[PDB]
Design a protein. Structure first.
Length: 245
């Protein structure tokens, strides 16, 4: 990619250099709706990562389109709109964005000879059996799943919910990081710069996750996830403090 934005984010008031400043990455998974939406803020002064899944049904203002589901942003305007939708939603810059489909996720999980996940629910195992028609049969405990098994894990929903599918997505993402330590992707980032970021991204001191508290909002059948505005301001201030903005 190459964002229809310029060099650095519009949200950044002062000049930005990624090799020295705290930054943010927006990972998007598309089969065009964006079904995986994970924002990660990397704090360089403290060597930490903060993850957060944006619910695909989040009642947000898509620029030039009004209030809608968050997932529709990528449908209405692709990458550039999603970033825009995020940048207005959280009042923070989206410095980097990576976009992947199923096969890219599968092939990177396989290139690492699997990612390790600790499955703890017979419910999710049963639903994955039913989803894959028996092709993917997970086990309770800590195991190394291949690309197909990882994708089935991050895709299932009916056992728990989509909001927990986001937490499963963040889990598998951090597992991918872990497995990469021992050593169809579209990026607004030269591969060389990604490799330059690789050591810092594989040497954090701690990683934390964030949730967005909200409530079901069903006007005339269509489902939306309305965000608790107080917790939203809280998370916005936290991310701004993390990024130094």
């Amino acid at each position: 990619v190459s964002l229809a934005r310029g060099e650095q984010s519009v949200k950044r008031i002062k000049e930005f250099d990624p090799g020295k400043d705290s930054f943010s990455v927006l990972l998007l998974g598309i089969d065009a709706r964006s079904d995986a939406n994970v924002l990660v803020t990397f704090n360089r002064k403290e060597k930490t990562a903060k993850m957060l899944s944006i619910p695909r049904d989040a009642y947000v203002n898509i620029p030039g389109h009004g209030y809608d589901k968050f997932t529709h942003a990528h449908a209405y305007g692709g990458v550039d709109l999603t970033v825009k939708t995020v940048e207005e939603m959280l009042d923070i810059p989206v410095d980097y964005v990576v976009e992947s489909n199923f096969t890219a996720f599968e092939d990177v999980v396989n290139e690492l000879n699997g990612v390790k996940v600790t499955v703890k629910s017979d419910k999710v195992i049963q639903q994955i059996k039913k989803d894959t028609k028996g092709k993917v049969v997970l086990q309770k405990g800590t195991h190394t799943l291949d690309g197909e098994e990882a994708l089935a894990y991050v895709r299932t929903r009916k056992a728990d919910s989509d909001l927990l599918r986001g937490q499963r997505q963040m889990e598998v993402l951090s597992a991918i990081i872990d497995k990469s330590k021992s050593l169809n992707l579209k990026m607004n980032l030269s591969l060389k710069d990604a490799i330059g970021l690789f050591p810092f991204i594989t040497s954090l001191k701690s990683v934390e996750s964030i949730q967005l508290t909200g409530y079901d909002y069903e006007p005339a059948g269509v489902y939306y996830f309305k965000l608790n505005q107080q917790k939203l301001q809280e998370v916005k201030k936290e991310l701004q403090n993390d990024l130094g903005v």
